[PDB]
Motif scaffolding. Structure first.
Motif: not given
Ligand SMILES: Cc1cc2c(cc1C)N(C[C@H](O)[C@H](O)[C@H](O)COP(=O)(O)OP(=O)(O)OC[C@H]1O[C@@H](n3cnc4c(N)ncnc43)[C@H](O)[C@@H]1O)c1[nH]c(=O)[nH]c(=O)c1N2
Ligand SMILES: CC(C)=CCC/C(C)=C/CC/C(C)=C/CC/C(C)=C/COP(=O)(O)OP(=O)(O)O
Ligand SMILES: CC(C)=CCC/C(C)=C/CC/C(C)=C/CC/C(C)=C/COP(=O)(O)OP(=O)(O)O
Length: 452
Positions: A11, A15-16, A47-48, A185, A298, A302
């Motif tokens: 779900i 990236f995860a 994101c950055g 952020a 933050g 990765g």
């Molecule tokens: C402003 C800012 C800036 C940065 C960063 C964050 C922020 C907010 N980070 C952190 C980085 O953006 C973040 O930690 C990772 O993208 C997390 O990846 P995930 O896949 O866990 O989350 P992510 O939010 O990317 O994935 C969640 C996904 O699940 C989906 N979803 C959610 N609920 C659902 C449901 N009920 N049913 C179906 N789909 C559902 C969403 O639509 C989405 O596509 C970062 N990191 C880094 O390494 N370098 C950087 O430069 C930065 N800088």
């Protein structure tokens, strides 16, 4: 309603989630990944977009190429609050077109047998007989409400943690996030009036007044394009982050063309140790949902890929033992803690120290070079603040004649070392989780008192 059966339900396609699907593909399992966003928008959370190259190598992750790689990074410039001291930290990284790379990983996983449904939201958890057994899905592309049963659910819904938050509170997998254990952020991507000087270098600005609890950044996406933004600590009662951005943008980005804004937006960023357990009966949690973000700088993209890797390994182990209990999926914890989790715990403590330092402390520490780049590299990559390094820094801090939190640096290093060993000794079985967790809490609550 219609019912479908899969081995694994993922779900979230960030990236995860995408990494989990990629790593699990072509290994005898029937896998379904869903994401609420349309395919073209998957991975476009603010994101950055900066990710280290080392992560892609370690995990066997395909390098970002073509339009997926906007700008090559060769290092980071760290600025002191008074802008007098600038540290340079070399290292190869990528400024990504995050949605483009995210979607390729998904597309490749799809070519490897993984089924992907976009515009599909997991609404209700299927929780029966004390186990996570799947989810109710809503595919608004076909207007279908489908019931999908799975042996393991991979919760990768990002900071919203929208799925696991609907599970019973007695499950350790429903552990919530404290307000102070997160940052808010915000960033914008704009074109610049002049060409960016040293555009292969990221810029990070430390200043507790313009970005309390976090920092400002200036990430070039090219010769004339930059990802600029900031982060501040939540739960402190600070005003809106956009007030900080609007007020201090010109200081850190005087070269941007405000009429050439490409994207803008912000989101929550977890800044702590991961979930005490990232696995339970029939479910694994990864990414932001499992708090896999580096507590210091933050960075979470990765370590999200890392969590997806460990999720894949743990699930394969579970099927080889026919055991989808927390105990059967327990390798998820062992893998991730050794790969990144133990580092997070140490950096969780170090973060609390850094966030309480004054601008005068940071100005003094950087100008007087309390640590060198050899140990700074060692710090935010292995999570280790060596006692020999702390001693060397304390000899410099001893030259300070005013009261300062810097004098507690040796005690901080000892606390980081303590919690590091505690995480390396992660419980072998779920039955030892509660005892271990309370020991971790004692270390943290003790440390918080020592900073006062
Ligand atoms: C402003 C800012 C800036 C940065 C960063 C964050 C922020 C907010 N980070 C952190 C980085 O953006 C973040 O930690 C990772 O993208 C997390 O990846 P995930 O896949 O866990 O989350 P992510 O939010 O990317 O994935 C969640 C996904 O699940 C989906 N979803 C959610 N609920 C659902 C449901 N009920 N049913 C179906 N789909 C559902 C969403 O639509 C989405 O596509 C970062 N990191 C880094 O390494 N370098 C950087 O430069 C930065 N800088
Ligand atoms: C803005 C927010 C919320 C998070 C940003 C997270 C960051 C700083 C990401 C930077 C990732 C990146 C592109 C790093 C490149 C520069 C660098 C010092 C990389 C270090 O990684 P390694 O490549 O392993 O270092 P080595 O040179 O020792 O190999
Ligand atoms: C925490 C506050 C308020 C200020 C400090 C912010 C700092 C010091 C950031 C340090 C940037 C740095 C040295 C990052 C290490 C280089 C890097 C990005 C390595 C790769 O990241 P990993 O994902 O840990 O591997």
């Amino acid at each position: 309603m219609k019912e479908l059966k899969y081995d694994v339900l993922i779900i979230g396609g960030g990236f995860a989630g995408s990494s989990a699907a990629y790593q699990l593909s072509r290994r005898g399992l029937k896998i379904l990944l869903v994401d609420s966003k349309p395919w073209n928008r998957i991975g476009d959370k603010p994101c950055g977009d900066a990710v280290s190259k080392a992560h892609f190598d370690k995990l066997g992750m395909p390098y970002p190429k073509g339009e997926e790689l906007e700008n090559k990074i060769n290092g980071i410039k760290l600025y002191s609050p008074d802008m007098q001291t600038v540290w340079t930290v070399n290292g190869e990284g990528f400024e990504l077109n995050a949605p483009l790379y995210n979607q390729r990983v998904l597309k490749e996983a799809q070519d490897r047998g993984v089924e992907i449904w976009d515009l599909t939201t997991a609404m209700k958890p299927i929780f029966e007989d004390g186990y996570v057994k799947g989810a109710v899905l809503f595919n608004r592309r076909t207007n279908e409400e489908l019931t999908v049963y799975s042996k393991v659910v991979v919760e990768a819904t990002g900071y919203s943690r929208s799925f696991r938050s609907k599970l019973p509170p007695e499950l350790p997998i429903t552990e919530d996030l404290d307000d102070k254990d997160a940052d808010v952020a915000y960033r914008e991507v704009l074109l610049t009036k002049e060409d960016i000087e040293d555009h292969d270098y990221l810029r990070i600005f430390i200043d507790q007044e313009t970005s309390p609890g976090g920092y400002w950044w200036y990430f070039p996406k090219g010769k004339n394009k930059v990802n600029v933004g900031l982060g501040i600590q939540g739960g402190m009662g600070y005003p809106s982050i956009h007030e900080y951005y609007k007020k201090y943008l010109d200081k850190y980005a005087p070269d941007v063309d405000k009429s050439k804004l490409l994207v803008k937006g912000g989101a929550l960023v977890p800044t702590r140790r991961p979930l005490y357990t990232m696995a339970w009966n029939g479910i694994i949690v990864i990414g932001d949902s499992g708090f896999t973000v580096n507590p210091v700088h933050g960075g979470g993209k990765g370590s999200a890929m890392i969590s997806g890797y460990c999720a894949a390994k743990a699930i394969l182990s579970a099927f080889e033992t026919g055991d989808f209990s927390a105990s059967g999926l327990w390798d998820m914890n062992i893998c991730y803690v050794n790969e990144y989790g133990a580092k997070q715990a140490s950096l969780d403590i170090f973060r609390r120290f850094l966030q309480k330092l004054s601008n005068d402390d940071i100005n003094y520490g950087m100008k007087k070079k309390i640590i060198k780049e050899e140990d700074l590299h060692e710090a935010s990559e292995k999570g280790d603040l060596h006692l020999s390094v702390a001693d060397k820094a304390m000899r410099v801090i001893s030259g300070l004649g005013r009261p300062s939190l810097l004098f507690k640096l040796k005690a901080v290093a000892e606390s980081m070392k303590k919690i590091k060993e505690l995480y390396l000794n992660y419980p072998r079985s779920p039955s030892s989780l509660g005892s271990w967790r309370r020991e971790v809490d004692n270390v943290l609550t003790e440390f918080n008192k020592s900073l006062s």
